Amino acid sequence: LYFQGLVTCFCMKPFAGRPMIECNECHTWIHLSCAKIRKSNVPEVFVCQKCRDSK
Ligand SMILES: [Zn+2]
Ligand SMILES: [Zn+2]
């Protein structure tokens, strides 16, 4: 049950045992649902919105 209360996603809500996905570039852990990813179609490579719009 580690990191249960840890907030890493941009939505400011904690892990809470919800499915997560890591940005391939900034290494931030984002909620799978916040990443707008359907559980039936999880990409090999995920890049968060912020990294996509870098600089
Ligand atoms: Zn989130
Ligand atoms: Zn990123």
Residue numbers in the entry: 227 to 281
What did the study's authors say about this model?
To gain structural insight into this specific recognition of histone H3K4me3 by the PHD domain of PHF13, we determined the crystal structures of both the apo-PHF13 PHD domain (aa 226–280) and the PHF13 PHD-H3K4me3 peptide complex. (A–B) The crystal structure of apo-PHF13 PHD domain (A) and PHF13 PHD finger in complex with H3K4me3 (B). The inability of PHF13’s PHD domain to interact with recombinant mono-nucleosomes which are devoid of histone post-translational modifications, suggested that it may selectively interact with modified histone tails.
PHF13, also known as Survival time associated PHD finger in Ovarian Cancer 1 (SPOC1), is a chromatin affiliated protein that is conserved from zebra fish to humans. PHF13 has been shown to modulate various processes including development, DNA damage, cell cycle, antiviral host cell response and higher order chromatin structure, underlining its biological importance.
